[PDB]
Amino acid sequence: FWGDSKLAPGGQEGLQFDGINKMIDPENTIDLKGNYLEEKHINWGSQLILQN
Amino acid sequence: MTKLRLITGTVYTEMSAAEVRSYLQRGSKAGTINGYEDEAKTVPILISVESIEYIYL
Numbered sequence: 001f002w003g004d005s006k007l008a009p010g011g012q013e014g015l016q017f018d019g020i021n022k023m024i025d026p027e028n029t030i031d032l033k034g035n036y037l038e039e040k041h042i043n044w045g046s047q048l049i050l051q052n
Numbered sequence: 053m054t055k056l057r058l059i060t061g062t063v064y065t066e067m068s069a070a071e072v073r074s075y076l077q078r079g080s081k082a083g084t085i086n087g088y089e090d091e092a093k094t095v096p097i098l099i100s101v102e103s104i105e106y107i108y109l
Contacts, residue, residue: 038082040074 028052053091055108056099063099064088069109075101 003019006012028048030041053064054072065072065087075085083101088094 039080040082 056087057105057108058099058103059105063097064091065099069107072104072107076104 001019003016005014005016005018007014056063085099087097087099089097
């Protein structure tokens with residue numbers, strides 16, 4: 001879940017591997033702005049996955 | 053600012069008319085939306101969906 005490879009000094013390669021939080025394309029992100037998760041967001045996420 | 057007419061008075065919210073129309077359908081299960089009692093955005097309130105008479109479209 002929380003891997004990160006560019007954690008060496010200067011931004012070089014580290015010892016860990018990139019996780020899901022980094023391999024996901026930044027375009028496919030829905031920000032809730034600190035609110036509750038409701039029923040309507042599931043359909044939006046499904047549409048985001050389906051259009052690709 | 054979207055104007056909503058309730059039984060008692062009138063309240064305002066950020067969400068557009070299409071979103072509030074979607075919240076008023078039978079298949080949805082949510083029942084609360086965010087808004088303000090006055091257009092100056094001074095006091096925040098939590099609005100019950102089923103108390104809305106009509107939306108000032």
